[PDB]
Amino acid sequence: XXXXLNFYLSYFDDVAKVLPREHYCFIVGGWVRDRILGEPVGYNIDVDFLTTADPVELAKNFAKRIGGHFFVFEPTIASVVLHLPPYRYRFDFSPLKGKDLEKALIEDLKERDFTANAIAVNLDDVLSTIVYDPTGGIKDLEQGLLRPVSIENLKRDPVRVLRGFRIAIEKNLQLTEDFYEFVKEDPRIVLKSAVERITHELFKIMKEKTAHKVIRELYEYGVLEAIIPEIGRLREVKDPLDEHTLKTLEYLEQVIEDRAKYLSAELLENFGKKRVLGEFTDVELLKWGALFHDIGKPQTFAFYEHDKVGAQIVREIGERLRWGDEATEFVAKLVRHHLRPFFLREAFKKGELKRRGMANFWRECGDIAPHLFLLSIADAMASGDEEEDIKALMETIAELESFNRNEMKXXXXXXXXXXXXXXXXXXXXXXXXXXXXXX
RNA sequence: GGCCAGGUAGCUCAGUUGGUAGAGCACUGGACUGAAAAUCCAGGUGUCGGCGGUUCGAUUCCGCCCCUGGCCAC
Ligand SMILES: [Mg+2]
């Protein structure tokens, strides 16, 4: 039930100056875990607290001291957020009450999802170290295993099933047998929890670069298919299409790691700088774009228009899962034009590619260009093209980038403006354009 | 504090490259019928939440706020 500078944080002093003498505080969950696993503290810090005093007051005064922002939400829990450019701080204060402090702490630690997250230390021992792990989290961290405290705790809050999938990949741990068994039983249980949370955990999975294996895990057990029924529809078309999407995602990640070679400088400049949902990038949207790259093949076949229908389906998924409108529109636009570089390459291999089509390409979509390129290369890798084909593709991309880098520098008024911009690349020309427009 | 979605005629709802805000229902009137229902025809001066900015021109593009709701430990 117990065991015995490492857990230190600069802000743990501040909390201590706030928390009253007669009340106690405990550091619980991920932070502790992250410190036990030995992973270096990143640029995003999240600390979880259990206090015997009013968490709202404590948090408000803490934010008062650190000059951060404070908010409360629903028992009722409090949180403080301190955000500057290099780092992000989130401190979540939770209520702890009972006649017996130790018994209350223990009872709380048994209601948590996983053993790793059930470890807690006393705040007074942090700055000066007896640890509380009734679920035996440390022992499981010694074996590198993520083991749910109980299955009833997982059923109590279904969304936890995704965290276990994320954390295992995030902290590099292996999920136990009982978890996979519970997932085998009822994969649909995930749907019981709120949608936006599922969206959040999914995006958190897509954040890391090993995500394709996790996606395969979620698909194979039917969880992914249960959250997104459109994914299963890839099984009715025998190429296997689903395998092709999974491998497209894998190769997409392997390309993302190597992305510095394939793309040019100006394209890589703003790559991954697009903030979606206030913590995520367009890279995750690129991975979603790779999973969804063909969602329309079961829709239309004999797949001529499958990219348009695909864009529509993606739009509906984004609407259904409550993504950002800019996000879902980004992914939909990424699926819509997903086959464009293949037609540009195919027109290049015949030498029939001209500045017209390039101008149209950069006019039509210049924002999704890097992502569309990486996705095209990924799909080319997943299709198993001959060397000549892929080389020709990368050469096509090269000529495109080389083209845009240098050579690109009452409809009456609109048509006039368009014709002017076209003729530019001199008011008499405008007068003549008007005289020609009259006829 | 962060993010997400709505705010439009009386109600409830369309308006994904910008180009005078229309359609259905509801409402009124007429034809028709002993009568009524049905059927057929006609009728929109709406500060597109507020203020600004880009544009020749903004319901749509951009920035700052307002109101309603949804999520935010492990
Ligand atoms: Mg935490």
CB atoms closer than 10 angstroms to residue A78: 24
Measured distance CA(A137)–CA(A104) in Å, rounded: 18
Pairing assessment for the beta strands A145-146 and A174-175 based on DSSP bridges: parallel
Closest CA to A89 of A65, A112, A57: A65
Task: Using only the alpha carbons of chain A, give its radius of gyration.
Answer: 27
CA distance A281 to A273: 6
Q: At residue A82, what are phi and psi to the nearest 5 degrees?
A: -120, 115
Between CA A367 and C1' B57 the distance (Å) reads: 27
Rounded Cα distance, A110 and A112, in Å: 6
Please name which of A210, A204, A196 lies closest in space to residue A44, comparing C-alpha atoms.
A204
Instruction: Report d(CA A215, CA A194) in Å as an integer.
Output: 20
Q: Judge contact between A116 and A139, C-beta under 8 A.
A: no
Separation in Å: B27 C1' and A321 CA: 39
Which candidate, A322, A318, A326, places its Cα nearest to that of A274?
Answer: A326
Domain residue ranges in chain A: 1-142, 143-409
Architecture of domain A1-142: 2-Layer Sandwich (3.30)
- State the CB neighbour count (10 A cutoff) for residue A53: 18
Question: Alpha-carbon distance A162 to A198, whole Å?
Answer: 8
Q: In angstroms, how far is the first alpha carbon of chain A from the final one? A: 91
Alpha helices in A132-240 (DSSP H): 137-142, 151-156, 160-170, 177-185, 195-207, 211-220, 223-227, 229-232
Sign of the four-CA dihedral A218, A222, A228, A234: positive
Question: Is residue A166 marked as binding?
Answer: yes
A231 CA vs B60 C1’ separation (Å): 32
Query: Two tokens at A68?
Result: 């951060």
Q: How far is the CA of A411 from the C1' of B28 (A)?
A: 39
Cα(A404)–Cα(A359) distance, integer angstroms:
8
CA dihedral A42→A79→A116→A198, nearest 10 degrees, is: -90
CA distance A229 to A327: 20
**Resolution of the experimental model, in Å, one decimal:** 3.5
A322 has binding-site annotation = no
Residues, CB < 7 Å to strand B? A 28-30, 46, 48, 69-71, 73-74, 77, 79, 81, 92, 94, 111-113, 117-118, 157, 159-160, 163, 194, 196-197, 200, 276-279, 322-327, 410-411, 413-414, 417
Torsional class of A275: left (φ above 0), alpha (ψ -120 to 50), beta (otherwise): beta
Residues A148, A143: Cα–Cα separation, whole Å: 14
* Approach to solving: X-ray
Task: Name the nt closest to A93 by C-alpha to C1'.
Answer: B73
Sheet holding A120-122, edge to edge: A69-73, A77-83, A88-95, A44-51, A25-28, A120-122, A131-132
Question: Which tokens sit at A41?
Answer: 């503290």
Element (H, E) at A370: helix A369-383
Tokens 């902290």, residue? A171
A255 within 8 A of A271, measured Cβ to Cβ: no
**Backbone torsions φ then ψ of A45, nearest 5 degrees:** -110, 130
Q: Which long-range contacts (CB under 8 A, 24 or more apart) does A353-358 make?
A: A353/A396, A353/A399, A355/A403, A355/A407, A358/A399, A358/A400, A358/A403, A358/A404
